Design a protein around this ligand. Structure first.
Ligand SMILES: *[C@@H]1O[C@H](CO)[C@@H](O[C@@H]2O[C@H](CO)[C@@H](O[C@@H]3O[C@H](CO)[C@@H](O)[C@H](O)[C@@H]3O)[C@H](O)[C@H]2NC(C)=O)[C@H](O)[C@H]1NC(C)=O
Ligand SMILES: *[C@@H]1O[C@H](CO)[C@@H](O)[C@H](O)[C@H]1NC(C)=O
Ligand SMILES: *[C@@H]1O[C@H](CO)[C@@H](O)[C@H](O)[C@H]1NC(C)=O
Ligand SMILES: *[C@@H]1O[C@H](CO)[C@@H](O)[C@H](O)[C@H]1NC(C)=O
Ligand SMILES: *[C@@H]1O[C@H](CO)[C@@H](O)[C@H](O)[C@H]1NC(C)=O
Ligand SMILES: *[C@@H]1O[C@H](CO)[C@@H](O)[C@H](O)[C@H]1NC(C)=O
Ligand SMILES: *[C@@H]1O[C@H](CO)[C@@H](O)[C@H](O)[C@H]1NC(C)=O
Ligand SMILES: [Fe+3]
Length: 492
């Protein structure tokens, strides 16, 4: 039987230390495998409730370089035919289409515009049920997809859970990414959470050379094409990271992220692609924005207060959050970088009994002991960071507590969001300092390996967490495993 959080924190563990190569545009998996207006990059996303889901896809090739001419999204329809059997696609839904462009008004830089992106919401679905579907435009010969299938989340209730939820972040599109995704797919998750930093298109110049701020947007299309075997069969929920900012003409940001994925923004009443909520069985998930105003006077905070007040913990016992930047990572990389977000939101989330937090951003794996306001606390959330999806940026290997590695405080805050909130500790072992001189006691486990996690919620009190390292391929391999046990009578 696996160990558990029920008997308190564990003594910290650091796994001793042991670039990825981006997939080339010659890889058949990233090339166009369809012609004309046939769908590609097909992806399923959850709605706010299990009884609805989104199907999205792109029709038409992108344009890169020269005098790009954005496509008219009204010229290709957005239709999904679906049903309970592969030969019985008797239900129909329609949606809307859009394009986005990536434009730079500087000599020598190249412009991009997308294929036509489609988003269709299916309503009136049975929970826990396999649906077969085709997408495309039935009025254009050859413009319908093959038949695909996905399974809706189980019905919302305290003993009803998806079997496995995969959690990844900072995938990029390297050969190590393919290892992460293959490991994940072999675990047959019912749901994928992607905690920001998707394609790493901004590691390229517009002319395709791999390193104002620039991107090579075709990496998004390569990513979407590579991921389609997963996303067309498995719902995937994405939240933005800093690599999605992709600032362009007129200060426009997040164009690719906001256009490409479906989010339950309207259904969960966030009306933002950057944060939203949804239920999957008895789990209420909140995806938060580390890169949209998170201050107590802002819209995201107001939405979050409203969202939390509606959660009934007898219906959804589990309250789980995801966002890009960790609050309790002990690596030097991005150490205390999101402190202002923690200071803004942590007390609100603690007051509502947040159970688990998943993040990315730090290119390594870390699991915290239960913690609130830098204090080990039996009612604090477990913070797990899985930004180790395999992108081409350097792995995080140095720890802030390593001798001589404590960063200068003023160098740590996120420059995009601004502010400084990371003051020296005033109590505990590290009182008077910015960092510890050994692994902090709120850090249970940290390892500089690529991998993915699987969450298996069992009932209203127990969830089994497993993290799998990419370099282990044998059956049943697991790097870190623990039962996360909640105590609602104690903490709520
Ligand atoms: C919610 O799910 C958890 C996890 O499945 C339940 O706890 C688990 O309950 C089973 C059955 O009582 C325990 O199995 C027993 O484990 C011992 C070894 O520890 C073994 O010798 C027995 O033959 C038997 O297999 C299991 O240990 C226990 N696991 C943990 C971490 O507590 C829990 O009871 C469920 N709660 C509700 C309200 O349903
Ligand atoms: C890219 O688009 C911007 C805005 O329309 C324009 O200023 C620029 O000239 C374009 N660059 C090229 C090579 O077409
Ligand atoms: C990334 O993949 C390469 C090639 O398979 C492998 O040699 C390397 O060890 C992987 N890197 C990590 C940190 O696992
Ligand atoms: C892309 O632009 C950079 C910076 O000017 C340049 O160094 C590089 O050689 C260019 N790559 C190509 C394929 O033109
Ligand atoms: C772009 O951002 C700067 C501030 O960073 C601002 O001065 C400027 O007015 C903005 N331009 C537009 C079109 O919003
Ligand atoms: C967190 O700890 C600091 C210093 O002890 C304290 O000033 C602050 O009020 C605490 N924040 C809470 C309880 O939300
Ligand atoms: C905070 O701690 C660092 C060492 O981590 C130290 O250099 C610095 O002087 C401290 N700042 C204050 C105001 O105490
Ligand atoms: Fe990041």
């Amino acid at each position: 039987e696996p160990a558990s959080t029920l008997e308190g924190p564990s003594r910290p563990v650091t796994v001793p230390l042991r670039h990825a190569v981006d997939l080339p545009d010659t890889d058949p998996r990233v090339q166009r495998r369809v012609t004309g207006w046939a769908p590609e990059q097909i992806a399923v996303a959850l709605s706010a409730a299990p009884t609805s889901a989104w199907v999205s896809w792109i029709t038409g090739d992108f344009q890169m370089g020269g005098a790009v001419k954005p496509l008219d999204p009204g010229t290709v329809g957005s239709v999904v035919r679906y049903g309970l059997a592969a030969d019985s696609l008797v239900r129909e839904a329609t949606g809307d289409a859009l394009v986005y462009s990536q434009l730079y008004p500087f000599e020598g830089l190249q412009n991009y515009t997308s294929g036509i992106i489609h988003h269709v919401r299916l309503q009136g679905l049975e929970p826990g049920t396999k649906y077969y579907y085709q997408c495309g435009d039935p009025s254009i010969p050859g413009a319908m997809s093959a038949v695909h299938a996905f399974r809706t989340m189980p019905a919302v209730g305290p003993r009803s859970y998806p079997g496995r939820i995969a959690v990844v972040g900072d995938l990029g599109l390297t050969y190590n990414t393919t290892s992460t995704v293959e490991h994940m797919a072999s675990n047959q998750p019912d749901l994928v959470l992607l905690l920001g930093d998707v394609s790493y298109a901004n590691l390229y110049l517009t002319n395709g050379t791999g390193t104002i701020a620039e991107t090579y947007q075709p990496r998004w299309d390569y990513w979407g094409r590579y991921m389609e075997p997963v996303t067309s069969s498995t719902p995937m929920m994405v939240v933005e990271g800093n690599h999605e900012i992709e600032q362009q003409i007129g200060n426009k940001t997040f164009a690719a992220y906001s256009a490409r994925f479906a989010f339950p923004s309207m259904e969960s009443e966030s009306f933002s692609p950057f944060y939203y909520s949804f239920d999957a069985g008895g789990i209420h998930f909140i995806m938060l924005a580390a890169y949209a105003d998170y201050s107590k006077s802002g819209e995201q905070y107001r939405w979050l207060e409203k969202d939390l007040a509606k959660v009934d913990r007898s219906v959804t016992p589990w309250l789980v959050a995801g966002w890009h930047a960790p609050w309790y990572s002990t690596y030097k990389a991005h150490y205390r970088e999101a402190e202002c977000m923690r200071v803004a939101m942590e007390e609100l989330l603690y007051s509502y009994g947040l159970d688990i937090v998943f993040t990315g951003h730090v290119h390594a794996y870390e699991r915290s002991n239960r913690v609130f306001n830098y204090t080990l606390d039996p009612c604090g959330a477990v913070h797990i960071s899985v930004g180790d999806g395999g992108n081409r940026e350097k792995m995080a290997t140095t720890h802030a507590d390593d001798p001589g590695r404590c960063p200068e405080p003023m160098s740590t805050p996120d420059a995009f969001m601004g502010g400084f909130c990371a003051f020296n500790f005033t109590s505990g072992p590290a009182a008077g300092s910015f960092c510890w001189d050994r692994q902090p006691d709120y850090s249970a486990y940290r390892e500089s390996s690529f991998g993915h996690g699987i969450l298996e919620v069992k009932n209203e009190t127990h969830a089994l967490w497993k993290w799998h390292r990419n370099q282990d391929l044998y059956q049943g391999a697991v790097g870190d495993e623990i039962y996360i046990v909640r105590e609602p009578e104690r903490c709520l």
